[PDB]
Design an enzyme around this catalytic site. Structure first.
Site, short mmCIF file in Angstrom:
data_model
loop_
_atom_site.label_atom_id
_atom_site.label_comp_id
_atom_site.label_asym_id
_atom_site.label_seq_id
_atom_site.Cartn_x
_atom_site.Cartn_y
_atom_site.Cartn_z
N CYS A 201 9.55 12.24 19.75
CA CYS A 201 9.20 11.23 18.73
C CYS A 201 9.56 9.81 19.16
O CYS A 201 10.61 9.56 19.77
CB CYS A 201 9.73 11.58 17.35
SG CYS A 201 8.66 12.78 16.56
N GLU B 264 3.39 5.97 9.00
CA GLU B 264 4.46 6.54 9.86
C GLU B 264 5.03 5.59 10.91
O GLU B 264 5.86 5.98 11.76
CB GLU B 264 4.01 7.89 10.48
CG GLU B 264 5.14 8.71 11.17
CD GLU B 264 6.31 9.05 10.24
OE1 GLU B 264 6.11 9.07 8.97
OE2 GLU B 264 7.43 9.28 10.78
C1 LIG Z 1 9.78 14.20 16.45
C2 LIG Z 1 10.98 13.94 15.53
C3 LIG Z 1 12.01 15.06 15.59
O1 LIG Z 1 12.23 15.67 16.65
O2 LIG Z 1 12.73 15.44 14.37
C4 LIG Z 1 14.00 14.86 13.99
C5 LIG Z 1 14.20 14.81 12.47
C6 LIG Z 1 9.00 15.46 16.07
C7 LIG Z 1 7.96 15.90 17.13
C8 LIG Z 1 7.14 17.15 16.74
C9 LIG Z 1 7.96 18.38 16.28
C10 LIG Z 1 7.32 19.63 16.92
N1 LIG Z 1 6.54 18.98 17.98
C11 LIG Z 1 6.36 17.72 17.90
O3 LIG Z 1 5.58 17.02 18.72
N2 LIG Z 1 8.29 15.19 14.80
C12 LIG Z 1 8.59 15.88 13.68
O4 LIG Z 1 9.43 16.78 13.66
C13 LIG Z 1 7.82 15.58 12.41
C14 LIG Z 1 8.69 14.94 11.31
C15 LIG Z 1 9.39 13.70 11.86
C16 LIG Z 1 10.79 13.57 11.75
C17 LIG Z 1 11.43 12.43 12.26
C18 LIG Z 1 10.67 11.41 12.88
C19 LIG Z 1 9.27 11.51 13.00
C20 LIG Z 1 8.64 12.64 12.48
N3 LIG Z 1 7.33 16.84 11.87
C21 LIG Z 1 6.36 17.53 12.48
O5 LIG Z 1 5.83 17.13 13.50
C22 LIG Z 1 5.88 18.83 11.90
C23 LIG Z 1 6.73 19.97 12.46
C24 LIG Z 1 6.23 21.31 11.96
O6 LIG Z 1 6.04 21.52 10.77
O7 LIG Z 1 5.93 22.32 12.96
C25 LIG Z 1 5.68 23.72 12.75
C26 LIG Z 1 4.32 23.91 12.07
C27 LIG Z 1 6.80 24.32 11.89
C28 LIG Z 1 5.66 24.38 14.13
N4 LIG Z 1 4.50 19.04 12.31
C29 LIG Z 1 3.47 19.04 11.46
O8 LIG Z 1 3.65 18.92 10.27
O9 LIG Z 1 2.09 19.18 11.91
C30 LIG Z 1 1.02 19.35 10.97
C31 LIG Z 1 0.96 20.81 10.56
C32 LIG Z 1 1.92 21.36 9.70
C33 LIG Z 1 1.86 22.71 9.33
C34 LIG Z 1 0.83 23.53 9.82
C35 LIG Z 1 -0.13 22.99 10.69
C36 LIG Z 1 -0.06 21.64 11.05
#
Ligand SMILES: *[C@@H](CC(=O)OCC)[C@H](C[C@@H]1CCNC1=O)NC(=O)[C@H](Cc1ccccc1)NC(=O)[C@H](CC(=O)OC(C)(C)C)NC(=O)OCc1ccccc1
Ligand SMILES: *[C@@H](CC(=O)OCC)[C@H](C[C@@H]1CCNC1=O)NC(=O)[C@H](Cc1ccccc1)NC(=O)[C@H](CC(=O)OC(C)(C)C)NC(=O)OCc1ccccc1
Lengths: 188, 188
Positions: free
Chosen positions: B147, B71
């Protein structure tokens, strides 16, 4: 440098998340069960404090002798815990400040610290159509969600955040004499 | 206490706001014209850096020997300023940490500091459907918009923020050997 440690000690012992019909606000507790919140939060007779519904025993919307909004509401709360008394950290007088920190405590941001730089005694502000006095200004692009946030320098708690125009942020002043033990007026 | 001064020195000299098709990210500059950004930012051949469109001369999406996403994408940028070299603040090895700060630098939040507490070497994370390795976890409700944010303790730059599930936040590790001057592979 900015007084992060001081800001953090205030946030840790003297803030709660408060929620009214207008949304969530950082809430500074000042002494006993007395706290503050921006007037435009529209406090009624109950409020959520850290998601626990709570009687508001008193609410005073501060105004100066020109009958103008100061944007501070002082509330007295029906809860068990007393706030650490931080009145001795409140400034006695209006002033300009250096290198201040704005600290926020909401559900979205449980502790966040933003150095806002120099803080100037700004005076008059037209706050969302409401003339308002005794405002502090900092050049930082503050945002929605930051209202009620606590503005400190080391050793001083100086204001709570109430507004911004995209480039500057504005805090209502806190002054020591807002909270001094006192006498008898009919006030509602 | 949390190392706010250290975090602030890193933010001041070594971050820029980066914007790709996926939106804005805090961007840590590491040395020369080399910086990092989460892989899911989808860097192409140009990127905005502090709103100035900028050639991306190189982009390496890091993966470990199991062919799994780490990542982290390392980018080399066509710009005039060199970054202060902060490679000596990068940890040599995987580790757990105490009392870390997460620092953000975007248009919405030009400098914000969030104590996230203890940071644990977490390992495997399913990141938005992508298996990912070498993750750091902190128990803080991190949000979209954070992020790329820089995770430090005093004296160490340990990761950049990449994810969260509403209760925990996750950072991809930074390790000293990601950036050591080296030899000759065809890599695209
Ligand atoms: C930063 C990037 C962004 O804002 O998106 C622009 C495309 C973001 C920060 C996190 C999102 C929620 N809180 C955060 O601290 N990261 C993401 O969105 C990341 C993908 C990404 C995209 C672009 C750049 C870097 C990374 N995705 C996640 O973090 C997912 C979000 C998610 O699925 O949240 C819910 C469960 C819907 C609430 N998080 C994740 O997958 O965590 C592991 C997980 C998944 C499902 C169940 C339990 C645990
Ligand atoms: C905190 C409260 C909140 O989020 O609203 C819930 C009802 C919020 C913080 C500021 C908003 C934008 N950035 C901020 O730092 N304060 C306000 O929204 C405040 C009213 C209010 C409501 C509830 C509690 C406390 C205070 N209103 C303003 O700050 C206005 C917003 C505004 O008009 O912004 C634009 C100009 C549309 C961008 N700010 C304001 O009036 O500044 C003076 C001004 C006005 C017009 C032109 C130039 C300058």
């Amino acid at each position: 440098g900015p007084g992060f440690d001081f800001a953090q000690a205030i946030m840790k012992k003297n803030t709660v998340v408060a929620r009214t019909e207008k949304g969530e606000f950082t809430m500074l507790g000042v002494h006993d069960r007395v706290a503050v919140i921006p007037t435009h939060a529209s406090v009624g007779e109950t409020i959520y404090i850290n998601d626990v519904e709570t009687k508001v025993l008193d609410a005073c919307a501060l105004r100066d002798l020109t009958d103008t909004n100061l944007e501070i509401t002082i509330v007295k709360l029906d809860r068990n815990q007393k706030f650490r008394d931080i009145r001795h950290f409140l400034p006695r007088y209006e002033d300009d400040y250096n290198d201040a920190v704005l600290s926020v405590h909401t559900s979205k941001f449980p502790n966040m610290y933003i150095p806002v730089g120099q803080v100037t005694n700004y005076g008059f502000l037209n706050l969302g159509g409401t003339p308002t006095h005794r405002i502090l200004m900092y050049n930082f692009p503050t945002r929605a969600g930051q209202c009620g946030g606590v503005v400190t320098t080391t050793g001083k708690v100086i204001g709570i955040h109430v507004g911004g125009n995209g480039a500057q942020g504005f805090a209502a002043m806190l002054l020591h004499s807002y909270f001094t033990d006192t006498q008898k007026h009919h006030h509602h």
